[model samples]
Target: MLDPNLLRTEPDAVAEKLARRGFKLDVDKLRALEERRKVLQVQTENLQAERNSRSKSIGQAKARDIEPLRLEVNKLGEQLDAAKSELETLLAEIRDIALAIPNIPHDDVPVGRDENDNVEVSRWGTPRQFDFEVRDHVTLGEMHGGLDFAAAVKLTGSRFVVMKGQLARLHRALAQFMLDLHTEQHGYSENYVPYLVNQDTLYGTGQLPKFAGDLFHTRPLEEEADSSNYALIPTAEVPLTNLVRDEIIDEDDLPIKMTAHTPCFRSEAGSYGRDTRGLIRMHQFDKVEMVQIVRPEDSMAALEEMTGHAEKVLQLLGLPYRKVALCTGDMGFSACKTYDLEVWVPAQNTYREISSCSNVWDFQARRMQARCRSKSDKKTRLVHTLNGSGLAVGRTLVALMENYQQADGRIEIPEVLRPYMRGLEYIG
Candidate 1:
C-alpha cells in the first residue's frame, strides 16, 4: 500500500505521480476526508479532556453546582462517542480506497501502455541455430515418453502435466539446480514455505482483496479440518516477502534475502486461448523465487542486483534470453519498477518471460507493517521489498528442451546440468 501519511500530506503530488501509471487519484475526496478527520480528532480529544476536568470539579462542587457539572460531563461523553464512531468509519473508507491504489511508477520507468511498449535492456547468449526441423517441447516430450499431457488430463485436467523417465528427472534437476544456485551463490536464505497460506498473509503481500479470482483458495472440510481460510500460493513471493510482516528488525538486518522452491497454483481465470498448449501456460508449476527486504536507500540497487541473480540462472543454463524494462502501464500492482527476463523458445520463434523482478519499494512493507529501526534514530519506518522468479522451473525446462535438442530427436543436457544428470550425457 502507498503510505497513508503521504496520501494525507500530498494528495496532489501523489495524484500527479499516479497519473504516469494511468491511475487517477481522487484528490478532492481524499482531501475532504483528511480535513474532516483533523477536525474530529481535535474535537474528540477536547471532549475527553473537558469531561475529565468537569468530573474532577463535580467531586468538589457544592450541592447546587454538582447536578449541572454532571449534566455537562454527560453531554461531552455523548459527543465523544459519536465522534469516535464516525472517525472509525471514515478511516475504514479511506483504507478501502488506499488499498486499491497502485504504487506510483518510478520516474525512470518509460511512460507507455502494455508489453509492446516495454524496452529491451540487453540480450544474453545467442539463440542456437538448428539444422533440422525444430520441434516444440511437447513433440520432444512425446518422442522420449517424457511428457504425458493425456495422463495429466485424465488424472486432473488441462494445464497440468506428468513427466516420466529422463524428462521428469530433468525437470526435478532444474528446480534443484536453480534453488541451489540462489541459496549458495546469491546470498539468500533458503526457506521451506507453506503451499497453503492464510488470507492475512496474502493481504500482507498485496494479493488479497484484489486478484483473488486469480488464486486457488481452499475451504476447510465441514467435519474434518479447522476453520482456517487458506489459498494455494501463486508464488513464493507471497510467503517469502511476508516473512518480515509486522516485524521490526535491527538496522544490521537491513537487507533480508530469501529464496524458496515451491509449486505455484493459479486459476489463470481470464487467460483463455492464450499459451493454451503445452507447459508454456499451466495451472500448476514449480518456481524458484527470490525476495529481498532492504532499507529505503538500498532498494533500487537491490533491484538491479536481484535481477542479475535471475539472469545468472539463464546464463548458467546456456540459454539465450533478453532483459526487458517494463513500461509504466505494464507493471504489476505493487511494483514501482519492473524487469522481465525472456528466454528464447525455438518453437515459438520468440522470447517468452521466464522471470520478472520488481522493486515494489515500500508498497508491500507498508501494507505488511514490516519495519526497521536504527539505534541512532530509534524510530521505526517501513522497509523496502523486492521479489522475482529466479527462474520458473517448468518454463526453464521448455527453453532447455527447445534449445538443446539434437537432430535425431535426442536431448543434450546442458554441461552445467550434466552433473545433476549423474554423468549422463544425452537422452533419446
Candidate 2:
C-alpha cells in the first residue's frame, strides 16, 4: 500500500519509484479512474441537492393544491437514483486500482532488476577447505540415515521429507538453539503462536489480497470452525507481527522485539524444477523467525541489529558466510529494503541464501492497521514492522551436515550446541 496522499497528489512520483523495482504503475488508468470518481461524486451530490430542493417545492405546491409538483418530485428521484449507481461503480474502480499498486522502496535501495545485481555488504568467517571429495547435504543425510525422501514421497508426495533419529533431533536442536539465542542472548521475547490463522490475519501481514499463491490454505471451514478457521502459517513472522494488529500500543512499547519457532508451510505453487532436491526447497520446514514493531525512526536500526541476530547464529555455528543487500527487484513484496545472509556450503563451493532480514517500513502496518499512539498526539498512526528468519532450521541442518562433515562419516557438533545436545559431541 502507498500513502494515499501520494496517489491523490503526486501519483507520478509514486509511479517513478515503482519503476525501479520493474513494476510498471498503470498511472494513466489510475488517473482516469480517479477523475471518473470525482466526476461521479460531484454529479451525485448535485443530484441529491436538486432532489431535496424539488421535494421542498413540491411540499409547498401540495399545500397550495397543485398536482404538477408531484411529477417534478418523481422526476428528481429517478435522476438521483441513476446518479448514485454511476457514482458507486466509478469509486469502486478507483479503489481497486489503488489497492493493486505495491509499496515503493526507499530511495537508498540499490536499483536493479534481480538477485544477480544485488550488492554484497560483507563476508564472515571462512569457507573451509577440504581434502576429500565433498558430498552435498542430500548424500550425507541419506548415508547417515538421517533423512527419508522415499518414505516422504510415498506418504505425502514431492517437496516433502521425513527426518529420523539424529537428523530429526539435529533439526529440532537448530530451531531451539536459534530461538534461545534471540530470546536469551538478544532481547527478543519468545512466543508460542498458532500455526493456523484467518484470512484477516494474513492480510495484516500483507499475505492476503496478494501472494496467496505461496500459502497453504485449509478447506472452507464449517460453521463451528469458520470464525476460528486458519491457514497454515507460511512464516512465524505472520502471526508474530500480527500480534498487535488493529491495536494501539503505548509509545514505551515501541520497538517491540519478538521471536518464535514454527513449522512453515508453502505451496511453492509455481516453483517447478527449482532447488528440487534436499532441504534447500521444501513444502514444509521448521524456522525460527524474528519480528519487530518499531517507530518509523527506529526501524532501520532494528533491521541492522536484527541482521546481526541472524549473523550471530552462523558465527556461533562456525559457518562461513556473507551479507548482501537485496536489490530493488530482488527484495520481497513487502520489504522496502532487504539483506540476505548467505552461508558457505563446502560441498557446493559457493554461498547460498539462508536468511532474509527486511525493513518493511509502514507497508505492512498500513495494511494491518497495526498502529501506535503518535508521540506528539493521542492520535494513532501506522507502526513500522520488520521481520527476518533468525535462521531456517532445515537449511541450517543441511549447512551443518556439509560443513562439519568428517572423513569418518561423523558430523561434529559446534561447541555452542553441546549443552543443548545433552553433552553429545558428534552425530555419526
Candidate 3:
C-alpha cells in the first residue's frame, strides 16, 4: 500500500527497501510494463480520437451521398476497438505488480534483517524473582483442568485449546479488562465490528494483493455466486481500521480511536516449526486491539501513545516488560515503524511479545480511500492510521501463571486483575 508515486515515479528507490526486508522486487519488469502501458494508453486515445472524427465524417457523408467515407469510418472503429483492448491489458498487468510491492520503511526505522537486530528502547516494572520452581502455562493449565490441549487436538487439531470454568472466565475477563481500560482511560471508543471481510477490506490493511496466506478463508455459503470466498478476521485491526474505508471525516474529528476485543484467526502459514508449543503461537487467540485514525502530523506521537496504552496494562499488572523497536526488515507490511512489548516469562526465562504497536502512516488510508476534510478549505486528505494489540489475553494469562506461581502450584492473581477475577484469591 505504498504511495503510487513509488511504483510510478521511483520504483528503484522502493526496490531498495524491499531488498532490506529480503523480498526481491522486480523493478525492471515493472518499468517495462509501465512503459508499455504508457505507450498503449497514448495510442488508444489517439485511435479513439481518429475514430470519432471518422464517425462524424461518416454521418456527414451519408447525408451527402459519400459511401467511401462510411467504409473508412467502419475501419477506424475496428482499429479503436483493438487499441483500447491492448491498453486495458497492459494497464492490468502493471496494476498487478504495483499492488504486490510493500510499503517503504521510514528512514528512522532501524535497519536489520530480522528480530535479532531489534533495539530495546525501554523497560517497565521488573521480572519478579522466583523462590519456587516455575511451571509452564501448559503444565499449570492442565493441572487445574483449565487448559485442555488434548481435547483441542482431538476436536480441531494442534495449535488450539479449550479453557473451561474459571480459566475460561479468566480468559474472557482479560479481554473485558483490556477493552474497558482502553475505552475509559486510553481515550478509545468501544466498537463491536464484523469478523468477516471481503478482499477489498484486506487490501485496505495491506494484507491482500500480498500476504494472503496468513488468513483463513471461508467459502461462500449462500449457494450461488460468481465468487464465494470470505476471509475470517485476522485481527480486529483489519475490520476496525477498515471502518474509515472510503470515508471523509471532518478535520475536527481527525483523531478517531477505537478498541475491540475479538478472537483473531490466523493460519500461521509461514511460521512452521516455531513456537509450536504453549499459547505463544496459536491459530486462534483473544486480543484487545486498539486502532487510531489521526492526522498526518500526529501519527508519530500517536504511535508513542498507542504503545503506552499497551504498556499501561503490563504496568498495572506489575509484570516486567521491555519495549523493542522493530528493525526495518522485521516490521509488518503496512507499518512504517513498530514497537513490540515483550513481557517476562518465568518458565521460559525470557521475554515474549505481548503486543505490537505500529504507525502505518498513510499507507492504508491511501489504499482504503480514507480521508479527512480540512476545516478551513474543506479539502480532503489522507489520514495516518495505526493499530496495536492493547494486549494479548492468552499471553497475559500465561505470563501471570508463570510469573506469579506459588510453591503449591497456585497463582496469585495480579491486583489489577483481581477485581475482574470476581474477588477470587488464587487459581490452583
Candidate 4:
C-alpha cells in the first residue's frame, strides 16, 4: 500500500505521478475527503476540550450549582462520541482507497503506454540459424507424444496440458534445476510452501483487493469461516514473499533469500486466446520462484542481482534471451521497478518473457508489516521485497523444444540439462 500521508499531504502530486501509468486518480474526491477528515477531527478535539472544561468547572463550583454544568459536559461527551466515530469511518474509507492504489513507479522507470514502449537493456545469446523447416512447440511436443493436449482436454479443459514420457521428466528437471541453482549458487533457501493461501496472504503481496479475477478461489461444501478468502496460489512469489509477513528480523538478517518450486494456477482472467495453442500461457504450470527480503537501501541492487540469477539459468542452457526494463504503464501493481527476461523461441522467431524480476521496495513490507531493526540504533524499518521466476519451467520447456529441434524431429537436450536427464543427449 502507498503511504496514506502522500495522499493527505499532496494528492495532486501523487495524481500526476499516477498519470504516467495511465491511472486516473480522483484528486478532487480525495481533497474533499481530506477536508471532511480535518473538519471532523477538529470538531472531535473541540468537543473533548469543552466537555473536559465543563467537568472541571463543576469540581470548582459550589456543590448545589454543579448539575447544569455536569449536564452540559454529558451532552458535549455525546457529540464527541459521534464525531470520533465519523472520523474513524472516514479514515477507513481512505485506507480502502490506499489499499487499492498501485505503487508509484521509480524515477528511473521508462515512461510509456505499455510493453511496446519498454526499453531493451541487453541480449545474452543470438538466436540460432535454422538449417531446415522449423516446427512450433505444438508440433515438436507432439512428435513423441511428449505434450498431450488431448489428455489435458479430456481431464480438464482448454489452456491446460499434460506432459508425457521424457518431456514430463524434462519439465520436472527444469524446476529442480532452477531450485538447485537459486538455493546453492544464488544464496536462496529452498522452501516447500502451501498452494492454498488465505486472503490476508494475498493482500500482503498486493494481489487480493485487485487482481481477484486472476486467481482461482475454492469454497467449502460445508459452511466455514474464511472459505471465501482462500485460493490456489497464482505464483510461488505470493507464498515465498509472504514468508516474512509480520516478521521483524535483525539487521544481520537483512537479505533473506528464499526459493520455491510450485505449480502456479492462473485464471488468465484478462488475456484469452493469446498463445492459446502452446505452453506460452497455461492455466497450470510449474515454476521456480525466488524472493528476497532485504533492507530498503539494498533493494535496487538486489533487483539487479535477482535478475542476474534468473538470467544465469538461460545462460547456462545456452538459450538466446534479452533483458528489458518495463515501462511504468507495464509494471505490476506492487512493483516500483521491474525487469523482464525474455527467452528466444525459435519457431516464433521472437523473445517471449521467461522471468520478471521486480523491486517492490517497501510497498509490500508496508502492507505485511515485514520489518528489520538495526543493532546500531535499534530503529525499526520496513524491509524491501523482490521476487522473480528463477525461470518458468513450462515456458523454458517450450523455449528448449523450439530452439533445440534437430530437423529430423528430435529434441536435443541442452548439455547442462543432460545430467538431470541421466546423461541422455536427446529425446525424439
Candidate 5:
C-alpha cells in the first residue's frame, strides 16, 4: 500500500513514476474521487458541529420555551446522520483506490520496460567446461529411476515430480545444508511456520487483491468454518516476514533476521507452456527463505548484506552464478529493488534464476503495520522488510546434477554437502 497522502499531495508525480513500471495511473479519476472525499468529509464534520450546537441550544432554550428549538435539533440530527452515511461511502471508495496503487519506485532503481533492460551487477564461479555431451536436468534426473515423472503425473498431475533413492536424499540434504548455513553462519534465527495462512497474511505481503490466481487455496470441508479461507503458502517469505506484523519492536532490535525451509506451492496460472519439462517451474518445490526487518536508516545496507547471505550459498556450493539488478518492470509487486541470482545450467548453456533477493523497504511494513520505536525519542515508525531465497532447493539440485555429472552419468556431490549425504561423494 502506498502512503495515501502521496496520491493526494502529488498525483501527477506519483503517476509519472508508476509509468516507468508499465502501470498507468488514472490521475483524472483519482483526482475526482479525492475531491469528492474532501468535500464530503468537510460537509459531514460541519453537519456534526451543527447538530451538537442545536442540541446545546435546545437545552438552554428549555428554560425559556424550547418546543421550536427541540424540533430544529431533531431535524439537524437527521441531516447529520445522512451526511455521515455519504462520508463513509466516499472514504471507502478512496481506500479501495489507494490499496490498488503500487509502491513508488526507489530513486536508484533502473528505469526499464522488462527483464532485457535489467543490468548485471557481478558474476561468481565460472561455468565449468564439460568435455562430454551434457544432459538437461530432466534427462539426468530420469536416469537410474531417480526422478519419476510418470509416477508424479499418475499421483498428482503435471508440474509435479517424484524423487526416489539418492536423488531424494540429495534434495533433502540441500535444504538441510541451506537451513544450517543460514541459521548458524548467517545470523538468522530458524523458524518453523505454518504451510497454510489466512488472507490477512497474504494481504500484508502484497499477494492479495492481486496475484490471487497464482496461489493455491484450500476449500473448507463441510465441518470447517466459512471464514477459513486458508491458502497454501507460495513462499516462506509470507510467514517469516509477517512475524513482525502488527508489532512494534524496540530500536535495539532493529534488524531481525529469520530463515525457514519449507515447501512452496504455486498455481503457475499465467505460465502454461514454459519450463514444462523440468523442475524449473513446478507447482510444488522446496526453498530456504531469508527475511530481515530493519530500521529505515539501515534498509539499503541491509539489502546488500541480505543478498550476500544468498550469494554465500551459491559460492559454497561452487556453482557458477551471476547477480542482476532487476529493472522497475521486472521487480516483484512488493519490492522497491531486487537482485536475482541466476545459476548456470550446463545443458541449457545459460543461467536460470535460482534466487531473487529483494529489498521491499517499508512497503510491506506499512501494510502489516510493523513498526519500531526509539527509546530516546518515543517516536514510532514503520520498519523496512526484506526477503530472498537463500536458494531454491530444487533448482540448486538441478544445477548440482548437471554441473557435477561425470562422463558415465554419475553425480559428484559438492564437498560441503558430503557430511549431510553420509560421507558419500557421488550419487548415481
Candidate 6:
C-alpha cells in the first residue's frame, strides 16, 4: 500500500508516476473522496465535543431548560453516528482505489511496456558446447527411468511431475545446496514456513486483491465452517517476508535476512499452451527463496547484493546465465525495481528465468505495517522489503540435465552438488 499522506497531499504527482507503469489513477475521484472524508471527520469531532459540553452544562442549567437540553444532546448523538458512518465509507473507498495501484517504479528503472523492452545487464559462463545435437530436458529425462510425465498425469494431472531415482535425488540436492549457501554464506537465517497462509498474509506481500486467479486455494470441510480462508503459497517469499508483518524492530536490527526452501503452488491460470512440455511452467515447483527487511536507505543496495546471491548459485553450479533489468511495466506488483537471472538452456538456445530479485521499497512494509523504531529520533518508519529466488530448484534441474548431457544420454552431475548426491558423478 502507498502512504496515505502521499495520496492525500500529492495525488496528481503520484498519479503521474503510476502512469509510467500503465496504471491510471483517477485523481478526480480520489480527491473528491478525500475532501469528503476530511469534512466529515471534522464535523463528527465537533458534534462529539458539543454533546460532551452540553451534558456537563445540563446540571448547571435551570430546571425548565433541562428538557430542551436533553433533546438537543440526543440529536447531536444521532448526527455524530451518521457522520462517522459516512466518513468510514469514504475511507474504505479510498483504500480500495489505493490498494489497486501498484508501486511506482524507481527513478533508475527503464521505462518500457513489457518484457520485450527489458535490458540485459551481463552474462556469466558461456553455454556448453555439445558434440551431439542438444536435447530438451523432457526428452533427456524420459530416456532413462528419471522423469515420468505419464505417472504424474495419472496421479495428479498435467503440470505436475514424477521424478525417479537419481533425478529425484538431484532435485533434492539442488534445494539443499541453495538453502545452505544462503544461510551459511549469505548471512540469512534458515526458516521453515507454512505452505498454507491466510488472506492477510497474501495481502501484506501484495499477492491478494490482485492476481487471485493465479493462486491455488483450499476450502475447509463443511464441518469446519468457522475456519479462516487459506491459499497455498505461490513462493517462500510470501511466508518468509511476512514474518515481520505488523512488527516494529529496533533500529539496531535494521536489516533482517532469511531464507527458506519451500514447495510453491500456483494455478498457472491462463497459461494455456505455454511451456506445456517441460519443467519450465508447473503447477508445483520447489524454490529456495531469500527475503530481507531493511531500512529504506539500504534497500537499493540490498537489492544488488541479493541479486548477486542468486547469481552465485548459478556460478557455483558452473551453469551459464545472464542478468536482466526488468522494465517499469514488467516488474512485479510489489517491486519498485527488479533484476531477473535467466539461465541458458542448451536445447532451447535461449535464456529462461531461474530467479528474480526485487526491492519493493516501503510498498510491502506499509501494507503490513512492518516498521522500525529509530534509536536517534524514536520515530517509527516503514522498513523496505526485498525477496529473490536463490534458484528455482525444478528449473535448475532442467538446466543441469540439458547443459551437462553426455553424448550417450547420461547426465553428469555438477561438482558442487556431488557431495549432496553422495559423491555420484553421473546419473542416467
| Model 6 per-residue lDDT at 108 | 84
Tens-digit lDDT string for candidate 6 (359-425): 9999999989999998789599899999999999999999999999999889999999999988999
Candidate 3: tens digits of C-alpha lDDT, residues 303-421 = 99999999999988888999999998798888888999999998888999999999999899998999998879947889999999989999999988888778877778878888898
Error of 5 at 428 (Å): 2.0
**Pairing residues by index, what is the TM-score of model 6?**
0.92
Note each model's CA RMSD in angstroms: 3.3, 3.6, 2.5, 3.7, 3.0, 2.8
User: Candidate 3: where are CA atoms >4 Å away?
Assistant: 50-82, 222-224
lDDT to native, each model: 0.90, 0.86, 0.87, 0.89, 0.90, 0.91
Minimum summed lDDT over a 10-residue window in model 2 is located at 221-230
Candidate 6: where are CA atoms >4 Å away? 47-82, 221-227
How many pairs in model 2 have backbone atoms within 3 A of each other, for residues 3 or more apart or on separate chains, i.e. clashes?
Answer: 0
Candidate 4 accuracy as TM-score: 0.90
Number of the candidate with higher lDDT, 1 or 3: 1
Per-residue lDDT for 137-215 in model 5, tens only? 7888877578888899999998899999999999999999999998998899999999999889999998887778999
Q: What is the lDDT for 29 in model 5?
A: 82
lDDT of 4 by residue, 278-334 (tens): 997798999999899999899999999999999999999999999999998999999
Model 2, which residues run further than 4 Å from truth? 43-92, 224-230, 374-376
Least accurate stretch of 10 residues (summed lDDT) in model 4?
A: 220-229
Query: TM-score for all predictions?
Result: 0.90, 0.89, 0.92, 0.90, 0.91, 0.92
Among the numbered candidates, top lDDT falls to 6
Candidate 1 lDDT over 1-428, as tens digits, reads 88777887788898988887889998888778878888888987888888788888888776434777788889888888998898889988777778889999998799886888999999999888889999999999999999999999999999999999999999988988888898888899999999999878888888876789999888886774775778999999999988998899897977899999999999999898898889977999999999999998999999999999999999999999999999998999999999999999999999999999999988899888999999889688889999999899999999999999999889999999998999788997
Instruction: Tell how far residue 155 is off in model 4, in angstroms.
Output: 1.2
Point out the higher-scoring one by lDDT: 2 or 4: 4
Q: Write the per-residue lDDT of candidate 2 for residues 1-428, one digit (tens) a residue.
A: 67877777997888889999998988888878877777888888988998898788876866765457778778889988988988887766765666566668987789999989999999999788887888888888888888999999999999999899988888888888998899999999999999998888887777766678898778765775657556899999899988987888887778799999999999998888888888877999989999999988888889899999999999999989999999888988788989999999887788988999999998888877888886678577789999999899988998898999888668888888888888799997
| Quality of model 4 by C-alpha lDDT | 0.89
Deviation from native of the Cα of residue 412 in model 1, angstroms: 0.8
